[model samples]
Target: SHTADRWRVSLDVNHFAPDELTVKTKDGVVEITGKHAYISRCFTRKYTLPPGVDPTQVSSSLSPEGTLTVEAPMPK
Candidate 1:
């Protein structure tokens, strides 16, 4: 079998603080939500995780430049 070693997804969450964003994974669905405290802004996004991904090991990070990245390693 051959496939990517890992899966990664990135999005520009500009003007959004890390505390204003949420990441959730369940039933192979990746959920991303954002809420602004001082502003009337809210959004939700969902993605289907690829096959062979390790859901329990899924992780996310928000960069200083407001880039949100979600990643997971495939089964070894």
Candidate 2:
């Protein structure tokens, strides 16, 4: 039998259009592409899982070319 799980997640970024995103799934990945000559001055952003969620399992990365990737494992 297949079991179902729920996830409550949120993404918040500064200076980036479409500042919020939400999703739910068993497993998934996201990629953000952009070019910024001076990102040092830009505001830092974060993606968060609401209460009752595990933050340690969340993974994120920023490439030298200004590409951001985030991956998270979902509930069973």
Candidate 3:
């Protein structure tokens, strides 16, 4: 049976140098590729979700100049 239990992530870095970034996942995997001179000085990070949280519902955005923002649904 096919279950909706797989998650995949990818990142593209442009106009930057080669840099290393770290990504953490709760139940899936994350991948990063594509390097540029500007990216070398930049950094990326990821946070793992708690047990009852869904990663697919998560959202993120990045500015043209290389500023990344993540918005996750949180309980109040």
Candidate 4:
């Protein structure tokens, strides 16, 4: 009952390179992709936004220790 108007987005990207990570949004959909390679790893994830989410109003950060976090606002 406590969770509302906020969604927690987190990903384990410890094997990912900061230079290889990319996040983009359009038409309410968010796309995250990365390539971790010397010989490496690659991934892509996408989400369809629900009510109250402003794609242009989103923010994200990546940790040097390998985690990605995003906070998206939801409609009240």
lDDT of each: 0.83, 0.41, 0.44, 0.78
- Where does the lowest 10-residue lDDT sum fall in candidate 2? 22-31
Q: Distance (Å) between predicted and true CA of 18, model 3?
A: 7.6
Model 4 ranges with Cα > 4 A deviation: 1-4, 38-40
Of 1 and 3, the candidate ahead on TM-score is 1
lDDT of 4 by residue, 1-76 (tens): 5655775588888855545778897887888998764566778998777766877777788887889987787876
Best candidate (score: lDDT): 1
Candidate 2's C-alpha runs over 4 A off are 1-40, 50-52
Tens digit of lDDT per residue, candidate 3, span 1-76?
Answer: 5344423333444444335333333473332332334224555445445445455665555556564444444432
> In candidate 4, where is summed lDDT lowest over 10 consecutive residues?
1-10
- TM-score against truth, every candidate: 0.80, 0.35, 0.39, 0.74
Question: Across residues 1-76, which tens digit of lDDT does each residue of candidate 2 receive?
Answer: 5754444333333345323333322223332333334342323333444344444565554444434456555554
Better of 1 and 4 by TM-score: 1
* Candidate 1: tens digits of C-alpha lDDT, residues 1-76: 6775877899899865535888899988999999876556788999998876767899989888899999998766
Predicted model with the maximum TM-score:
1
Shift of residue 68 alpha carbon in model 1, Å? 0.5
